[PDB]
Amino acid sequence: HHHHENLYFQGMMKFFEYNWQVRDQWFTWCHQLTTEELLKNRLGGVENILYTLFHIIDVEYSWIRAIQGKEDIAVQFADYQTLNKVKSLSNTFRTEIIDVLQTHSDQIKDELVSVPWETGVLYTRDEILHHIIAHEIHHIGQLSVWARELKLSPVSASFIGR
Amino acid sequence: HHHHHENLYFQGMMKFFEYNWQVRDQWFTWCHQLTTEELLKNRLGGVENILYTLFHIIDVEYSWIRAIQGKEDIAVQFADYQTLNKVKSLSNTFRTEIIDVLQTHELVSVPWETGVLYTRDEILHHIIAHEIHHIGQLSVWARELKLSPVSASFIGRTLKPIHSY
Ligand code: NI
Numbered sequence: 001h002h003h004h005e006n007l008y009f010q011g012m013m014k015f016f017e018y019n020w021q022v023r024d025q026w027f028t029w030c031h032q033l034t035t036e037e038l039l040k041n042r043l044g045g046v047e048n049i050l051y052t053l054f055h056i057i058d059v060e061y062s063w064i065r066a067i068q069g070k071e072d073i074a075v076q077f078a079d080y081q082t083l084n085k086v087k088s089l090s091n092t093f094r095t096e097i098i099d100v101l102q103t104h105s106d107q108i109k110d111e112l113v114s115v116p117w118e119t120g121v122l123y124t125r126d127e128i129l130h131h132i133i134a135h136e137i138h139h140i141g142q143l144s145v146w147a148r149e150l151k152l153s154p155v156s157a158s159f160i161g162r
Numbered sequence: 163h164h165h166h167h168e169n170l171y172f173q174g175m176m177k178f179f180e181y182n183w184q185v186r187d188q189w190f191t192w193c194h195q196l197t198t199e200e201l202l203k204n205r206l207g208g209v210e211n212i213l214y215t216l217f218h219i220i221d222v223e224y225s226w227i228r229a230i231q232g233k234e235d236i237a238v239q240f241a242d243y244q245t246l247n248k249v250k251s252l253s254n255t256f257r258t259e260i261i262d263v264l265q266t267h268e269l270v271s272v273p274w275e276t277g278v279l280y281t282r283d284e285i286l287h288h289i290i291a292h293e294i295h296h297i298g299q300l301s302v303w304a305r306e307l308k309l310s311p312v313s314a315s316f317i318g319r320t321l322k323p324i325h326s327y
Pocket residue numbers: 055059135139
Protein backbone atom coordinates (compact mmCIF):
# COMPACT_ATOMS: atom_id res chain seq x y z
CA HIS A 1 0.00 0.00 0.00
CA HIS A 2 1.29 3.45 -1.08
CA HIS A 3 0.56 6.76 0.70
CA HIS A 4 0.39 10.22 -0.85
CA GLU A 5 3.63 12.25 -0.38
CA ASN A 6 3.32 14.25 2.85
CA LEU A 7 3.47 18.08 2.60
CA TYR A 8 6.53 18.26 4.89
CA PHE A 9 8.49 15.96 2.59
CA GLN A 10 7.39 17.87 -0.58
CA GLY A 11 8.50 21.21 1.05
CA MET A 12 11.91 19.80 1.99
CA MET A 13 12.38 18.25 -1.48
CA LYS A 14 11.60 21.59 -3.22
CA PHE A 15 14.71 23.04 -1.53
CA PHE A 16 16.86 20.10 -2.71
CA GLU A 17 15.58 20.44 -6.31
CA TYR A 18 16.25 24.20 -6.16
CA ASN A 19 19.77 23.62 -4.79
CA TRP A 20 20.64 20.99 -7.43
CA GLN A 21 19.38 23.16 -10.29
CA VAL A 22 21.33 26.24 -9.04
CA ARG A 23 24.46 24.07 -8.55
CA ASP A 24 24.29 22.87 -12.20
CA GLN A 25 24.06 26.52 -13.31
CA TRP A 26 27.20 27.33 -11.27
CA PHE A 27 29.01 24.37 -12.90
CA THR A 28 28.14 25.96 -16.31
CA TRP A 29 29.19 29.41 -15.05
CA CYS A 30 32.57 27.96 -13.90
CA HIS A 31 33.33 26.84 -17.50
CA GLN A 32 34.37 30.43 -18.39
CA LEU A 33 37.24 30.30 -15.83
CA THR A 34 40.64 28.59 -16.05
CA THR A 35 41.50 25.79 -13.56
CA GLU A 36 43.99 28.26 -11.96
CA GLU A 37 41.13 30.81 -11.49
CA LEU A 38 38.86 28.05 -10.10
CA LEU A 39 41.64 27.00 -7.62
CA LYS A 40 42.94 30.53 -6.68
CA ASN A 41 42.56 31.09 -2.93
CA ARG A 42 40.42 34.08 -1.93
CA LEU A 43 39.08 35.30 1.44
CA GLY A 44 35.78 33.79 2.65
CA GLY A 45 34.34 30.32 3.33
CA VAL A 46 36.58 27.49 2.09
CA GLU A 47 38.58 30.08 0.00
CA ASN A 48 38.47 28.81 -3.65
CA ILE A 49 35.62 28.32 -6.13
CA LEU A 50 36.37 24.68 -6.97
CA TYR A 51 36.82 23.60 -3.32
CA THR A 52 33.57 25.39 -2.41
CA LEU A 53 31.71 23.23 -4.94
CA PHE A 54 33.56 20.06 -3.76
CA HIS A 55 32.80 20.95 -0.12
CA ILE A 56 29.08 21.38 -0.83
CA ILE A 57 28.99 17.97 -2.60
CA ASP A 58 31.09 16.34 0.14
CA VAL A 59 29.02 17.62 3.10
CA GLU A 60 25.69 16.82 1.43
CA TYR A 61 26.70 13.21 0.69
CA SER A 62 28.38 12.64 4.09
CA TRP A 63 25.14 13.55 5.93
CA ILE A 64 23.00 11.44 3.55
CA ARG A 65 25.37 8.49 4.25
CA ALA A 66 24.99 9.11 8.02
CA ILE A 67 21.16 9.04 7.54
CA GLN A 68 21.60 5.59 5.77
CA GLY A 69 23.83 4.58 8.66
CA LYS A 70 26.70 3.66 6.32
CA GLU A 71 30.42 3.86 7.15
CA ASP A 72 31.87 7.33 6.75
CA ILE A 73 34.51 7.07 3.88
CA ALA A 74 35.53 10.69 3.09
CA VAL A 75 36.41 11.58 -0.53
CA GLN A 76 39.59 13.75 -0.76
CA PHE A 77 39.69 17.10 -2.64
CA ALA A 78 43.21 16.18 -3.97
CA ASP A 79 41.54 13.59 -6.30
CA TYR A 80 39.08 16.23 -7.75
CA GLN A 81 41.23 19.18 -8.93
CA THR A 82 39.20 20.12 -12.06
CA LEU A 83 35.69 21.45 -12.86
CA ASN A 84 34.91 18.28 -14.87
CA LYS A 85 35.97 15.94 -12.00
CA VAL A 86 33.95 17.93 -9.41
CA LYS A 87 30.92 17.95 -11.79
CA SER A 88 31.28 14.14 -12.25
CA LEU A 89 31.44 13.63 -8.44
CA SER A 90 28.19 15.61 -8.04
CA ASN A 91 26.57 13.28 -10.59
CA THR A 92 27.98 10.09 -8.99
CA PHE A 93 26.14 10.62 -5.68
CA ARG A 94 22.80 12.10 -6.93
CA THR A 95 20.82 8.87 -7.46
CA GLU A 96 21.95 7.52 -4.05
CA ILE A 97 20.98 10.85 -2.42
CA ILE A 98 17.51 10.77 -4.09
CA ASP A 99 16.90 7.12 -2.99
CA VAL A 100 17.93 7.92 0.61
CA LEU A 101 15.68 10.99 0.72
CA GLN A 102 12.74 8.94 -0.64
CA THR A 103 13.47 6.12 1.87
CA HIS A 104 13.35 8.63 4.80
CA SER A 105 10.18 10.47 3.70
CA ASP A 106 7.72 9.43 6.45
CA GLN A 107 6.25 11.42 9.37
CA ILE A 108 8.85 10.17 11.94
CA LYS A 109 10.95 13.31 11.35
CA ASP A 110 12.78 13.12 14.71
CA GLU A 111 14.41 9.82 13.52
CA LEU A 112 17.79 9.69 15.29
CA VAL A 113 21.03 9.63 13.27
CA SER A 114 24.44 8.79 14.76
CA VAL A 115 27.33 11.04 13.61
CA PRO A 116 30.47 8.94 12.80
CA TRP A 117 32.77 12.02 13.22
CA GLU A 118 31.24 13.07 16.63
CA THR A 119 31.37 10.50 19.42
CA GLY A 120 28.05 10.20 21.32
CA VAL A 121 26.26 12.90 19.34
CA LEU A 122 22.92 12.37 17.64
CA TYR A 123 20.94 14.58 15.32
CA THR A 124 17.45 14.09 13.96
CA ARG A 125 16.68 13.50 10.29
CA ASP A 126 14.75 16.85 10.42
CA GLU A 127 17.81 18.77 11.77
CA ILE A 128 20.15 17.24 9.20
CA LEU A 129 17.88 18.01 6.27
CA HIS A 130 17.54 21.67 7.34
CA HIS A 131 21.32 21.86 7.83
CA ILE A 132 22.11 20.34 4.39
CA ILE A 133 19.69 22.75 2.71
CA ALA A 134 21.08 25.86 4.47
CA HIS A 135 24.69 24.66 3.89
CA GLU A 136 24.53 24.75 0.11
CA ILE A 137 22.62 28.09 -0.11
CA HIS A 138 25.21 29.62 2.30
CA HIS A 139 28.27 28.54 0.27
CA ILE A 140 26.58 29.40 -3.02
CA GLY A 141 26.00 32.92 -1.56
CA GLN A 142 29.78 33.19 -1.12
CA LEU A 143 30.37 32.30 -4.81
CA SER A 144 28.17 35.26 -5.88
CA VAL A 145 30.62 37.71 -4.20
CA TRP A 146 33.70 36.14 -5.86
CA ALA A 147 31.77 36.23 -9.19
CA ARG A 148 31.49 40.06 -8.96
CA GLU A 149 35.14 40.31 -7.84
CA LEU A 150 36.02 38.47 -11.09
CA LYS A 151 33.88 41.10 -12.98
CA LEU A 152 31.37 38.40 -14.03
CA SER A 153 27.61 38.28 -13.49
CA PRO A 154 26.66 35.64 -10.83
CA VAL A 155 24.12 32.84 -11.35
CA SER A 156 20.72 33.96 -9.91
CA ALA A 157 19.76 32.63 -6.45
CA SER A 158 16.04 33.47 -6.92
CA PHE A 159 13.80 30.60 -5.86
CA ILE A 160 10.79 31.90 -7.83
CA GLY A 161 10.91 31.48 -11.65
CA ARG A 162 12.22 27.90 -12.08
CA HIS B 163 -14.24 20.05 20.90
CA HIS B 164 -11.80 18.48 18.38
CA HIS B 165 -8.40 16.70 18.56
CA HIS B 166 -5.51 18.97 17.35
CA HIS B 167 -2.35 17.26 15.81
CA GLU B 168 0.96 19.10 14.98
CA ASN B 169 1.43 20.51 11.48
CA LEU B 170 4.76 18.94 10.49
CA TYR B 171 4.98 20.98 7.28
CA PHE B 172 4.42 24.24 9.23
CA GLN B 173 6.97 23.43 11.94
CA GLY B 174 9.49 22.37 9.21
CA MET B 175 9.21 25.76 7.47
CA MET B 176 9.25 27.69 10.79
CA LYS B 177 12.63 26.13 11.83
CA PHE B 178 14.15 27.91 8.79
CA PHE B 179 12.67 31.26 9.95
CA GLU B 180 13.88 30.62 13.49
CA TYR B 181 17.39 29.80 12.21
CA ASN B 182 17.39 32.86 9.95
CA TRP B 183 16.22 35.25 12.67
CA GLN B 184 18.83 34.03 15.18
CA VAL B 185 21.62 34.22 12.57
CA ARG B 186 20.49 37.71 11.47
CA ASP B 187 20.46 39.02 15.04
CA GLN B 188 24.03 37.71 15.52
CA TRP B 189 25.07 39.59 12.31
CA PHE B 190 23.47 42.75 13.80
CA THR B 191 25.62 42.18 16.92
CA TRP B 192 28.71 41.51 14.67
CA CYS B 193 28.15 44.91 12.97
CA HIS B 194 28.76 46.75 16.32
CA GLN B 195 32.51 46.15 16.04
CA LEU B 196 32.60 48.02 12.69
CA THR B 197 32.87 51.75 12.08
CA THR B 198 30.04 53.56 10.26
CA GLU B 199 32.59 53.77 7.36
CA GLU B 200 33.10 49.96 7.30
CA LEU B 201 29.27 49.43 7.61
CA LEU B 202 28.34 51.64 4.61
CA LYS B 203 31.45 50.98 2.38
CA ASN B 204 30.66 49.83 -1.14
CA ARG B 205 31.99 46.32 -1.89
CA LEU B 206 31.61 43.94 -4.88
CA GLY B 207 28.76 41.37 -4.81
CA GLY B 208 25.02 41.39 -3.97
CA VAL B 209 23.61 44.79 -2.89
CA GLU B 210 27.22 45.94 -2.16
CA ASN B 211 27.27 47.21 1.47
CA ILE B 212 26.81 45.49 4.83
CA LEU B 213 24.04 47.73 6.26
CA TYR B 214 22.04 47.76 3.01
CA THR B 215 22.34 43.95 2.78
CA LEU B 216 20.66 43.67 6.24
CA PHE B 217 18.03 46.30 5.26
CA HIS B 218 17.36 44.50 1.95
CA ILE B 219 16.93 41.16 3.76
CA ILE B 220 14.28 42.58 6.15
CA ASP B 221 12.54 44.61 3.43
CA VAL B 222 12.13 41.62 1.07
CA GLU B 223 11.00 39.31 3.89
CA TYR B 224 8.39 41.75 5.23
CA SER B 225 7.04 42.64 1.75
CA TRP B 226 6.37 38.99 0.85
CA ILE B 227 4.81 38.23 4.30
CA ARG B 228 2.60 41.31 3.78
CA ALA B 229 1.63 39.94 0.31
CA ILE B 230 0.67 36.65 2.06
CA GLN B 231 -1.31 38.64 4.67
CA GLY B 232 -3.09 40.41 1.72
CA LYS B 233 -1.75 43.86 2.69
CA GLU B 234 0.35 46.28 0.60
CA ASP B 235 2.86 48.86 1.91
CA ILE B 236 4.58 52.03 0.78
CA ALA B 237 8.24 51.27 -0.02
CA VAL B 238 10.55 51.62 2.97
CA GLN B 239 13.42 53.83 1.82
CA PHE B 240 16.94 52.92 2.96
CA ALA B 241 17.68 56.71 3.18
CA ASP B 242 15.37 56.81 6.27
CA TYR B 243 17.38 53.90 7.96
CA GLN B 244 21.11 54.85 7.54
CA THR B 245 22.36 53.50 10.90
CA LEU B 246 22.76 50.06 12.44
CA ASN B 247 20.32 50.92 15.31
CA LYS B 248 17.63 52.10 12.84
CA VAL B 249 17.93 48.93 10.73
CA LYS B 250 17.87 46.73 13.92
CA SER B 251 14.73 48.57 15.17
CA LEU B 252 13.04 48.11 11.76
CA SER B 253 13.97 44.38 11.89
CA ASN B 254 12.23 44.00 15.26
CA THR B 255 9.16 46.04 14.17
CA PHE B 256 8.65 43.93 11.03
CA ARG B 257 9.25 40.71 13.03
CA THR B 258 6.37 41.48 15.43
CA GLU B 259 3.95 41.56 12.47
CA ILE B 260 5.58 38.56 10.70
CA ILE B 261 5.14 36.35 13.83
CA ASP B 262 1.40 37.15 13.87
CA VAL B 263 1.01 36.30 10.14
CA LEU B 264 2.92 33.00 10.51
CA GLN B 265 0.93 32.09 13.69
CA THR B 266 -2.40 32.44 11.69
CA HIS B 267 -3.69 29.09 10.30
CA GLU B 268 -5.07 30.65 -0.66
CA LEU B 269 -3.10 31.95 -3.71
CA VAL B 270 -1.12 35.15 -3.22
CA SER B 271 -1.12 38.10 -5.63
CA VAL B 272 1.78 40.57 -5.47
CA PRO B 273 1.33 44.33 -6.34
CA TRP B 274 4.58 44.38 -8.35
CA GLU B 275 3.94 41.21 -10.51
CA THR B 276 0.58 41.47 -12.44
CA GLY B 277 -0.78 38.21 -14.08
CA VAL B 278 1.05 35.83 -11.70
CA LEU B 279 -0.09 34.27 -8.42
CA TYR B 280 1.99 32.24 -6.04
CA THR B 281 1.25 29.64 -3.40
CA ARG B 282 2.08 30.57 0.21
CA ASP B 283 4.51 27.60 0.12
CA GLU B 284 6.36 28.98 -2.94
CA ILE B 285 6.74 32.37 -1.20
CA LEU B 286 8.00 30.82 2.08
CA HIS B 287 10.67 28.90 0.12
CA HIS B 288 11.68 32.15 -1.69
CA ILE B 289 11.97 34.21 1.55
CA ILE B 290 13.99 31.51 3.30
CA ALA B 291 16.50 31.04 0.47
CA HIS B 292 16.75 34.83 -0.08
CA GLU B 293 18.03 35.52 3.44
CA ILE B 294 20.48 32.57 3.60
CA HIS B 295 21.84 33.69 0.19
CA HIS B 296 22.61 37.30 1.25
CA ILE B 297 23.92 36.20 4.63
CA GLY B 298 26.40 33.99 2.69
CA GLN B 299 27.64 37.15 0.96
CA LEU B 300 28.31 38.81 4.36
CA SER B 301 30.63 35.98 5.39
CA VAL B 302 32.95 36.76 2.44
CA TRP B 303 33.11 40.46 3.42
CA ALA B 304 33.73 39.48 7.06
CA ARG B 305 36.89 37.56 6.01
CA GLU B 306 37.92 40.45 3.70
CA LEU B 307 37.72 42.69 6.80
CA LYS B 308 39.99 40.13 8.68
CA LEU B 309 37.08 39.27 11.02
CA SER B 310 35.47 35.94 11.86
CA PRO B 311 31.97 35.68 10.40
CA VAL B 312 28.95 34.62 12.43
CA SER B 313 28.21 30.86 12.30
CA ALA B 314 25.80 29.68 9.60
CA SER B 315 25.41 26.19 11.16
CA PHE B 316 21.82 24.95 11.55
CA ILE B 317 23.05 21.91 13.45
CA GLY B 318 24.11 22.42 17.07
CA ARG B 319 21.94 25.54 17.53
CA THR B 320 19.07 25.85 20.00
CA LEU B 321 16.09 27.26 18.12
CA LYS B 322 13.72 29.65 19.89
CA PRO B 323 10.17 28.74 18.78
CA ILE B 324 8.08 31.37 16.90
CA HIS B 325 5.55 31.24 19.85
CA SER B 326 8.37 32.14 22.36
CA TYR B 327 8.85 35.63 20.76
NI1 NI C 1 30.63 24.44 4.90
